[PDB]
Design an enzyme around this catalytic site. Structure first.
Site, PDB file in Angstrom:
ATOM      1  N   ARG A 133      82.220  45.766  44.860  1.00  0.00           N
ATOM      2  CA  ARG A 133      83.532  45.787  44.155  1.00  0.00           C
ATOM      3  C   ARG A 133      83.558  45.210  42.723  1.00  0.00           C
ATOM      4  O   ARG A 133      84.399  45.616  41.911  1.00  0.00           O
ATOM      5  CB  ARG A 133      84.666  45.139  44.989  1.00  0.00           C
ATOM      6  CG  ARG A 133      84.234  44.388  46.252  1.00  0.00           C
ATOM      7  CD  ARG A 133      84.012  45.375  47.417  1.00  0.00           C
ATOM      8  NE  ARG A 133      82.882  44.995  48.266  1.00  0.00           N
ATOM      9  CZ  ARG A 133      82.723  45.382  49.531  1.00  0.00           C
ATOM     10  NH1 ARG A 133      83.624  46.169  50.129  1.00  0.00           N
ATOM     11  NH2 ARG A 133      81.659  44.966  50.205  1.00  0.00           N
ATOM     12  N   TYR A 134      82.663  44.265  42.426  1.00  0.00           N
ATOM     13  CA  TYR A 134      82.550  43.698  41.076  1.00  0.00           C
ATOM     14  C   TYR A 134      81.510  44.475  40.279  1.00  0.00           C
ATOM     15  O   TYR A 134      81.654  44.685  39.077  1.00  0.00           O
ATOM     16  CB  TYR A 134      82.181  42.208  41.129  1.00  0.00           C
ATOM     17  CG  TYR A 134      82.862  41.448  42.248  1.00  0.00           C
ATOM     18  CD1 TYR A 134      84.248  41.241  42.239  1.00  0.00           C
ATOM     19  CD2 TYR A 134      82.127  40.939  43.320  1.00  0.00           C
ATOM     20  CE1 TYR A 134      84.882  40.556  43.272  1.00  0.00           C
ATOM     21  CE2 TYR A 134      82.754  40.244  44.359  1.00  0.00           C
ATOM     22  CZ  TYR A 134      84.129  40.061  44.326  1.00  0.00           C
ATOM     23  OH  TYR A 134      84.750  39.381  45.341  1.00  0.00           O
ATOM     24  N   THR A 135      80.473  44.913  40.982  1.00  0.00           N
ATOM     25  CA  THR A 135      79.320  45.594  40.401  1.00  0.00           C
ATOM     26  C   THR A 135      79.608  47.050  39.991  1.00  0.00           C
ATOM     27  O   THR A 135      80.132  47.826  40.791  1.00  0.00           O
ATOM     28  CB  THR A 135      78.151  45.536  41.411  1.00  0.00           C
ATOM     29  OG1 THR A 135      77.511  44.257  41.318  1.00  0.00           O
ATOM     30  CG2 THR A 135      77.155  46.592  41.149  1.00  0.00           C
TER      31      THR A 135
END
Lengths: 442, 442
Positions: free
Chosen positions: B86-88
């Protein structure tokens, strides 16, 4: 995590049905792998718990009307883990499709997703009162809205439309009380009343228990949310401990059946176990941005406001389109008459945009209609086509007058809602699974 | 789990790049959340380990040329866990796009997916020899193919095309040996030779180690696959245990740097640690259905056969289209001349299919061209259009003669491969990170 009053959904759930809808994972088409749908949710909307929710929506014993039809091991009344999403197949109910009905018609607000690439809906059209029907539970606020009989909820909504002032007692002629999918006996008519006014009330929920042919007692139906295997194991221990003075789970895929062999003993077991349970309404949902505890008429009221919004937005959508198209038609019939001049005029012009200008600046055409004409494929110059475009004008002046009347007249609109709600109740009517008795026994 | 000789990929990896490709998660467009791509793989192709592979393809220190560009914590040479999807963010390399180049051109076989709804490719066009370049490792068969210098592999392939009989020694003028992304010194010129013939050979791999300004020794580069933190902690213990007779990891985001302060000690540490390592080629990949251990010329040979297949299939695809279109054009110019008759003739006919028949049965038209004509939008009757359709005929008789020559003449085809391979090597040329010395030290 709390449901919206309008469509009864939490954001997990709304996201799952929408993804299913847009994939075309509808009822009329083949079941689809669960991963296929799950992998659209973590990937496009929700930042395991997706599958745990998708599964929960597919359970006979938790919802009065499933929103997902699942094929494969989807868990059990014994809280068995379900299969992995690769063996398990799913698709939408006919009934979930009513929640999503008209979504393709500028009826509900759409909002950017978590990563701001695509759009998702804030709320579903919810063409039937899902919140009361399937209810909701779970947590810093908690909710307890039990399920209700689909037809009982619609009729009551219908009665509310005719009389927005109708009392709680009067609605109870049509919404009798909770209708639990595991059935059982309900006790507490005052409890329902209290819950239906203040949002908060206590009822008692009983198992269906009868005697058989040495005499044997059978449990046919158990209280809502209660775990069968958990209950079997409770009845098991008291028998062992002589707190009563053997217990077989004769359940098979037919229906629930728990047998006990060895009135006063039925009245004993009710107490020191979940053979009899109490339920407490805590009717909280999301109105106007915040968590609001509400009784039955605020909820019917909120749903109705939602429907009015939806239907008015659908009607305006269908009107704008019907407006925009008749304009094309008006253009086409007009151009069909000057046909020969038109074709020569197009050849005269050098560019696409030239032809559009030399259409609008010579004859009384608009951009919208100029575009449509230059875009006609040559086959659209045939007889069937040079005549089917003349007829639909009749069907359009018809729709305009019809639709415009729905907007200009509030009663006409509410009638639309009344008809559509009504056909839904006829097509999906299901019989009451819960018996209601007035007083609570001690 | 073993790679295909042609595109160097395992099915996990091929599936991930293809999903990325078809989503349009290409280099020229914005980075996209990792979940977005991951959720297409479990969902559509692969029945955690998807993300562990997607990540591995994005690592500087494992592949000579990354196939995925990842933004966010993508792990470390210390085997640190990466961030959650989700951040990547990620997207394809310019270089991965060469693997997928031409896939949209009936070049490689497509096969039903696990659930038989959509289609996936058995192999990628692999417009550059990915197997040698990025190598492969892991397991009932194991593989060890080290990475190689892109330009060294292409030049050698190019040399093989001109002389399919070229010896292993002769290819070693152009493929010198493994080119490791962590650099370091290589020892064993015979090992490479043995590996390049039999598929199996032992080399020694050294760290780059120099002295500084009390005197201090620094490790600038470490052997391939070796874990930095794991190595630091090894050097740490011997210092403590006086097996040598302090050890700082001065690595920052600039480059690798390990400092030691307190020749014979450099020669000692090489032995009782992974400061010096040995690598053993086990060049196994999937040729013609089964696992085949193979030396360098079988691999170049297999790649070449693949390219020939690809390019011949691309050329046939581009020819069939160029054939099919000129036919439309031939039709259109012919119909442009009878234009006035044509339009009157269309009006004469009643149905769509009537117009098509009354075209083919009156004038010498075919279905293919009859369809195209009745489908012309009215703007296509303008001057720019009534003339740009006349010119492209020249550009088509040109392409036919060109493309047909590529099919009819095997040399011409191989030249096509040679040009395209060559431009790839120029545009992506990168300098050798590995020093090669002939003899192994003791």
């Amino acid at each position: 995590a709390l449901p919206d009053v309008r469509d009864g959904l939490k954001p997990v759930q709304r996201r799952i049905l929408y993804a299913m809808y847009s994939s075309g994972n509808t009822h009329d088409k083949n079941f689809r792998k669960s991963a296929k749908t799950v992998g659209d949710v973590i990937g496009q909307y929700h930042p395991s718990s997706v599958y745990e929710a998708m599964v929960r929506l597919s359970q006979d014993w938790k919802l009065r009307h499933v929103l997902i039809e699942m094929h494969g091991n989807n868990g059990s009344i014994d809280n068995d883990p379900p299969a992995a999403m690769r063996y398990t197949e799913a698709k939408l109910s006919l009934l979930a499709e009513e929640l999503l009905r008209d979504i393709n018609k500028e009826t509900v607000s759409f909002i950017p997703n978590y990563d701001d690439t695509t759009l998702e809906p804030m709320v579903l059209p919810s063409r039937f009162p899902n919140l009361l029907v399937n209810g909701s539970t779970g947590i810093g606020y908690a909710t307890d809205i039990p399920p209700h009989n689909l037809a009982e909820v619609i009729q009551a909504t219908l009665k509310y439309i005719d009389n927005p002032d109708i009392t709680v007692n009067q609605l109870m002629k049509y919404i009798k009380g909770p209708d639990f999918p595991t059935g059982g006996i309900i006790q507490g008519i005052d409890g329902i009343k209290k819950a239906y006014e203040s949002g908060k009330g206590r009822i008692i929920v009983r198992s269906k228990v009868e005697e058989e042919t040495r005499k044997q007692l059978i449990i046919t139906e158990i209280p809502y949310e209660v775990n069968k295997s958990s209950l079997v194991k409770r009845i098991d221990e008291l028998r062992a401990d002589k707190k009563v003075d053997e217990v077989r789970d004769e359940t098979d895929r037919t229906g629930l059946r728990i047998a006990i062999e060895l009135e006063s003993i039925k009245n004993y077991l009710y107490k020191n176990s979940d053979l009899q349970i109490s339920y407490n309404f805590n009717m909280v949902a999301i109105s106007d941005g915040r968590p609001k505890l509400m009784g039955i008429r605020q909820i019917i009221d909120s749903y109705l406001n939602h429907q009015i919004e939806v239907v008015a937005n659908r009607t305006k959508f269908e009107l704008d389109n019907a407006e925009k198209r008749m304009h094309i038609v008006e253009g086409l019939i007009k151009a069909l008459s000057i046909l020969d001049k038109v074709i020569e005029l197009i050849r005269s012009s050098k560019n696409k945009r030239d032809a559009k200008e030399n259409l609008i600046e010579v004859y009384e055409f608009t951009e919208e209609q100029a575009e449509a004409i230059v875009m006609l494929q040559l086959y659209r110059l045939t007889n069937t086509d040079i005549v089917a475009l003349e007829g639909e004008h009749k069907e359009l002046e018809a729709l305009i007058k019809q639709l415009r009347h729905i907007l200009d007249n509030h009663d006409a609109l509410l009638n639309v809602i009344k008809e559509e709600l009504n056909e839904i109740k006829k097509k999906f009517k299901s019989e009451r699974l819960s018996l209601i008795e007035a007083e609570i026994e001690e």
